[PDB]
Write a protein that binds this ligand. Structure first.
Ligand SMILES: CC(=O)N[C@@H]1[C@@H](O[C@@H]2O[C@H](CO)[C@H](O)[C@H](O)[C@H]2O)[C@@H](O)[C@@H](CO[C@@H]2O[C@H](CO)[C@@H](O)[C@H](O)[C@H]2NC(C)=O)O[C@@H]1O
Ligand SMILES: CC(=O)N[C@@H]1[C@@H](O[C@@H]2O[C@H](CO)[C@H](O)[C@H](O)[C@H]2O)[C@@H](O)[C@@H](CO[C@@H]2O[C@H](CO)[C@@H](O)[C@H](O)[C@H]2NC(C)=O)O[C@@H]1O
Lengths: 160, 160, 160, 160, 160, 160
């Protein structure tokens, strides 16, 4: 009953659906924005990376992020800014060996998974415009209704 | 000169184009909403279905609808609501053995086909926000300019 | 304990507060918009006016509205559009002999009063961006916390 | 060269300016929020208040705060939350016999004064969205450019 | 029918309205910015001023501008910058014996008056963020709908 | 490093990315609009076409465009209108033997290439609503961050 996988693409995710992205390299996993007050780009950091500066293309710009991962698992860094003039900061991190990342539009808020598998949990971010948040997804992904969030959770924490 | 077929997808359909969906199973054919005053999901009922409660995923929720089909043809039920806190009701039905369903954004209204093939006709639904109506399409579809609605009509009623 | 009256002005009302406007003429009571998907202007119609076209300045434009009022009470018509390209239509009406109109930003929605006093009730309207909805208020007005909505209700239906 | 006084009002303070509020009663001095990750309301406690629960209207809600002041001077309590679903806590206090409080948007942070006059100093609070922080001010206030912060400091600690 | 005068204040002007400011001294007439790509401050230069450096407080900072006026009329100089990392340059000038200055948010641009009365004309400046354009006005001002721009032009060039 | 090719589709291009379209026939290359103040359709004219009216389907309607190409290269005609009530006119032309056209949403404007390869240059068109500009693309295309605009320029003028 798993809807997918879908090819990398740019679209406005519908309300009340988890987008479950299967990361496949150490680059930008997705870029999300409404172009007013919400910019989040997730970068994937492979295990055992001493702190270092890396260049990522994010929202059409070349940006330098200092990056580290002292874990056996991958680390997916949520880099956030609320205006094109602010610099990004690492707002949240998901530490995972399943390499799946989740994003949901629900209840006026953006929900993502953070923590460390197999015990990662959801967290919310506010915005003045949830409906207009669009996403560029750089890997294969799946769509899971919120009615089946418990399944998505399981996937996030245990793999497909 | 038929534009398509395109793969299942989520997007905001352009104004003044018929979306012509070729249904392939007895589930949700498409879901359309502007998240303000218009929600429509079309469910496909195969021929000769005694009254029965069926579960469907619509706008991320698990909804139960009682459906029936006493016909030799398929029945495509428009489940409609005008508020996110209302339940759905069966607003229109397309009885068809071509299994093609159509939806058009035009003149401030949403136009669809209803009735029974080969004599299905267009009907309109009002909305205060036509431009922000988006759609999730669960099967292959085609795009037809409104300038060629006659052709679309033909297809709806007679198939490709 | 009533906060006000405040002079006519343009501002972005804070979340979770009723704005209570004391209309004083048969013109535009207020104009509210986020400049993306929500435009509401309220026009005041004095009692016993046979249907007639009248010119109003709304959102910087000269608009002609056909208005009628058979009642002995004033009629406050909510003219709404979701796009600067659409025509306004009369979305709601508050029939009142107190000349008080209310607007509240709460729960992701815009709440106003409609119906006929002293039995007027609240109703909501959806938007993709509630926070950025600003208002031009053409009369004296008061600010009442949502915690005291019952008082606001009394005011709307009974006068100050 | 002192810009003010201005009347109580709600607005989005410009970046790089101190708002200097002259408190005149033992109520809410101001309410400040961006509706995403920052809510501060300052309550004024008169001298010699034994520990007591007091009700205040903050951000449209009735809240009950435990307050106390055993000093000869007034206490201005910053009640803070970073999420609408958290209850407030007393994050900072300004103990003052000048009854002047200050708030500034600058360098990605909110700056206020705390400590005890005439030795009160500035302190910062972080936010993901500085530009959308607005304020409701319940008494007269002045605008001072950050270029003249020394003057503001003087006033905070010594009066006008 | 002229809406005003209003007292000096800080606010976000509504889209599609001229703000008509009656300058009353040789200082900063107004400051406008969206804090992303648009900063404009108009300075008033009395007649017969030899080229000289003057200090102005703009956007909370002390800035030195070299100003001149060899005419019998007042000169209003637009100092502009497209980034907080840049210095201001004199982008436009309005030469006027009426001491009225105009600014309008419309069509994705900021419109002002320039040239010399009674033959001043409008011109536009681009922005990517018009909705966030806020203004500090240091003199009395009026609000004129764009539908009455001719009248505004009249005032600009001839006085009230 | 080149992102693509992607299949013909309808979507809202992200801000700050060049869409680089590889035209493959003498039809409509793309259609772009926000349904408020911006409509552009690019039509491809093969070499050596005498001035003639040709029929194209744009934005769901049949239109006749006066078209010509007296050169050895292809010509890509931008047909533009600022309102649905206006007729299209040839606003710009790109004369090219690479058959690549470019469109970018940036800085409150739409940027395209015009002129003649290998010295085609970018030009801008204003809009009040850049976020809502969507595109129907009728051939394979690539996405190039604005940070790599030079590479896009190279492609435009010299091919892949
Ligand atoms: C004044 C009014 O209500 N006009 C209706 C019109 O809506 C206008 O369409 C304009 C087109 O851009 C514009 O948007 C304007 O703002 C609108 O008021 C339409 O809704 C038409 C519908 O015509 C019907 O179209 C469907 C779909 O193609 C066809 O299947 C129907 O056959 C067709 N009906 C008729 C009688 O032609 O109605 C009003 O003209
Ligand atoms: C965090 C950082 O890199 N710098 C801090 C700085 O913030 C920057 O300010 C820039 C303004 O030109 C620009 O906005 C940049 O993007 C920011 O990173 C400031 O936050 C200062 C704090 O300066 C303090 O300001 C308060 C309020 O005026 C004063 O009361 C303090 O006395 C003052 N302290 C100091 C040491 O200057 O901190 C970082 O430099």
């Amino acid at each position: 009953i798993l809807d997918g996988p879908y090819q990398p693409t740019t679209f406005t995710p519908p309300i009340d659906y988890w987008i479950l992205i299967n990361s496949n390299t150490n680059g930008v996993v997705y870029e999300s924005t409404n172009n007013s007050d919400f910019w989040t780009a997730v970068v994937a950091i492979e295990p055992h990376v001493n702190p270092v500066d890396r260049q990522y293309t994010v929202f059409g710009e070349n940006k330098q992020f200092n990056v580290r991962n002292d874990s056996d698992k991958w680390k997916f860094l949520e880099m956030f800014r609320s205006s094109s003039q602010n610099e990004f900061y690492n707002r949240r991190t998901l530490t995972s060996d399943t390499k799946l990342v989740g994003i949901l539009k629900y209840g006026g808020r953006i929900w993502t998974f953070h923590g460390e598998t197999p015990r990662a949990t959801t967290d919310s971010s506010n915005t003045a415009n949830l409906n207009d948040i669009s996403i560029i997804i750089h890997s294969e992904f799946y769509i899971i209704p919120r009615s089946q969030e418990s399944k998505c959770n399981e996937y996030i924490n245990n793999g497909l």
